């Protein structure tokens, strides 16, 4: 008869926040904020939120709580031809889950290796270090060479990732069994948090979403107590208003607030589906996003205080110590800074645990949206048991992550995250933004909000959904397609054909949306105007 609901408002109120907050909030925002105007990056970061991010977040969050349908069945009630979107996202998810979990696997392997009294990445007398390995608490006067490496860089590169055993994308096999066991434990800890439905995913989030703020607080007062930490904050907040003249940093801010907010994917749709009909949507979206940004903001300090201390211990120019913009900023730089602090075991355990709890909530929701849609599209054909479907998804993602668990797995992570998944999620998000605003009608949407909340949404939001948001996504998509960034990772430049592979994976994700449009266009009898009329008008 009817579907389930939430156990408490706070459970989903923290579930959506837990999905929104992840690793990128911690480390992607501080770097891009430091190199694009410093504190002045705060100005375009908010403008792209109020006009781009918040309208998509709220508009996405409203439809779910109004229609109470999955990512697939909701299109049958809006624009059946666009039902392929609900499938596209599914395929998209299969790609996303192929790498997003492996990162956590790395953190887990770093956590289980942090139970030793002497942390592995402090000394160089290990079984994986080379002759270039030079650590501290060693002879003074040491001078760095073009070939010299640090015990942290050696530990990440040659032990956990083991990327020295592959020559690139061409030859990357085989699979590392350690990270396979790690990602199995992770795929097990997400199973028991989803298999029961929204009951456990609203209860497990209590831990996964609150721990990172505590850990960030400890790391904050720690990095604030470190000598010479003001340099990282200065480099973090130094206004460079000339960056605002470049048309690039605005696109960077737009993309950053889009992926951090994460609209258009059906996760917010599914989370909103299980909720009260008369429940407020405005305040929910507002609070959650503003926290997601604030959390990024304080995370900036959490990183740059420690990196400032690292620049003080070395010789300044935080850009030099923060050259690498990736996991290496956390797994090498930040970790090496942790190793040189008292109670290093503590600050390592809580750090990697923080990473894992940062990732878990987003993977809970990440799967939750797809599971919800599929069950809603194939009801009671499906839903006979939930644990069965959730297990069938988790295992598929595990076999889908074996390509990422290889020695040259990080390369595939970059390729899929930047050349494949990204432009496809932006594309399908653009398709949704166009469909809801220009097909279903923005006036009827404001009428639905007027039904739930009791009042029609303001003109400020209507004018955003009509024009501001679709142009907001269009600008980012066009900016990427016009000039895809040259990929580089660990002194290795990607081949020229990488963009061909990424686009191949990207297009293969939404091959379902136009072919489904052709499907319904080929299924409905009569004239094409009557078929597109039964395809544009919701089900009678």
């Amino acid at each position, epitope marked *: 008869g009817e579907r389930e609901t939430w156990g408490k408002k706070v459970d989903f109120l923290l579930s959506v926040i837990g999905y929104a907050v992840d690793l990128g909030n911690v480390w992607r925002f501080p770097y891009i904020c430091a190199q694009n105007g410093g504190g002045a990056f705060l100005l375009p970061y908010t403008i792209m939120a109020i006009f781009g991010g918040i309208p998509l977040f709220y508009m996405e969050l409203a439809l779910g709580q109004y229609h109470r349908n999955g990512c697939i069945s909701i299109w049958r009630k809006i624009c059946p031809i666009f039902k392929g979107i609900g499938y596209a996202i599914c395929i998209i998810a299969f790609y996303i889950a192929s790498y997003y979990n492996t990162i956590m696997a790395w953190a887990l392997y770093y956590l289980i290796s942090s139970f030793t009294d002497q942390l592995p990445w402090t000394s160089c007398k290990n079984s994986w270090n080379t002759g270039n390995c030079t650590n501290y608490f060693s002879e003074d006067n040491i*001078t*760095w*060479t*073009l*070939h010299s490496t640090s015990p942290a860089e050696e530990f990440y590169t040659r032990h956990v990732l083991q990327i020295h055993r592959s020559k690139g994308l061409q030859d990357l096999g085989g699979i590392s069994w350690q990270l396979a066991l790690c990602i199995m434990l992770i795929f097990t800890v997400i199973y028991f948090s989803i298999w029961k439905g929204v009951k456990t995913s609203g209860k497990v989030v209590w831990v996964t979403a609150t721990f990172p703020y505590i850990a960030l607080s400890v790391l904050l007062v720690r990095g604030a107590t470190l000598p010479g930490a003001w340099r990282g904050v200065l480099f973090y907040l130094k206004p460079n208003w000339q960056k605002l003249l470049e048309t690039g940093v605005w696109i960077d801010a737009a993309a950053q607030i889009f992926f951090s907010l994460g609209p258009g994917f059906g996760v917010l749709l599914a989370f909103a589906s299980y909720n009260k009909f008369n429940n407020n949507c405005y305040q929910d979206a507002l609070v959650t996003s503003v926290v997601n940004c604030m959390t990024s903001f304080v995370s900036g300090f959490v990183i740059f205080t420690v990196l400032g201390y690292m620049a003080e211990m070395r*010789n*300044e*120019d935080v*850009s030099e110590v923060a050259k690498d913009a990736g996991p290496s900023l956390l797994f090498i730089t930040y970790a090496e800074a942790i190793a040189n602090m008292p109670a290093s075991t503590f600050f390592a355990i809580i750090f990697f645990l923080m990473l894992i709890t940062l990732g878990l909530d987003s993977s809970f929701a990440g799967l939750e949206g797809v599971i919800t849609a599929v069950l809603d599209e194939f009801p009671h054909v499906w839903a006979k048991r939930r644990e069965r479907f959730v297990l069938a998804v988790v295992i598929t993602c595990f076999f889908g992550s074996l390509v990422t668990l290889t020695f040259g797995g990080a390369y595939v992570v970059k390729l899929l995250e930047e050349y494949a998944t990204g432009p496809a999620v932006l594309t399908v998000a653009l398709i949704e933004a166009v469909a809801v605003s220009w097909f279903y009608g923005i006036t009827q949407f404001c009428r639905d909000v007027k039904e739930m909340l009791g009042f029609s949404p303001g003109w400020f939001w209507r004018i955003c959904w009509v024009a501001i948001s679709p142009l907001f996504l269009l600008f980012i998509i066009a900016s990427f397609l016009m000039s895809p960034p040259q990929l580089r990772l660990f002194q290795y430049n990607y081949p020229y054909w990488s963009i061909i592979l990424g686009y191949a994976i990207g297009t293969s994700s939404f091959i379902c949306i136009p072919t489904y449009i052709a499907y319904r266009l080929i299924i409905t009898p009569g004239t094409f105007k009557e078929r597109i009329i039964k395809s544009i008008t919701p089900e009678t």
Partner: antibody
Amino acid sequence: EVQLQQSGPELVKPGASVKISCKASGYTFTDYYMNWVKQSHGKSLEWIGNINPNNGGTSYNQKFKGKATLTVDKSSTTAYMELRSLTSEDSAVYYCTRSPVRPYYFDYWGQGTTLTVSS
Amino acid sequence: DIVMTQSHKFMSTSVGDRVSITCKASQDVSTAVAWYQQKPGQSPKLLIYSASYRYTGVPDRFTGSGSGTDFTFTISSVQAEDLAVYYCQQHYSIPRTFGGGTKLEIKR
């Protein structure tokens, strides 16, 4: 016996180009950044840019972007700097100096190259 | 960028006196200052690195001190062959800049 032997003096007409060499010896050539410092007559030193010999990893100065081009040859352990669009301001003494990654000091310098840009 | 300012373009000293050259930077530098010696007609020669540390092959009479923006290069016993132009240079932020240069003239 770390020695950096540059090329001789060059007299070139304004608007032309000039290439200066830098033969290195006495150390592992693939271990250190190779730099080029411009010193004007009676002025101070002015860092032009470095280059990574392993892959040719150049790093120029914003003041010299598009003015100097650094190359390197591992087969003979020799660095090169080319200057185009020569004017009267380019008539100065140029050095090529070895430098580690950190701390970035200039331990060994070349003998210098007196460049005269005049017709 | 960084502006390494040497206020004293010329300094006079005698054989055996204690001479100290100052170097003023734009921002805070911590301990990233190098002192080079360039004799008239020769290439610059590295003397001090990282504020105080001496390089290999440098007499003990050349010292260095300072931590922040103002730095000092000190010579205890000035010799006749110590006649050269001294330069200070920051080595933290890109690009690496130099000082104006202090031509040390000997008084007799």
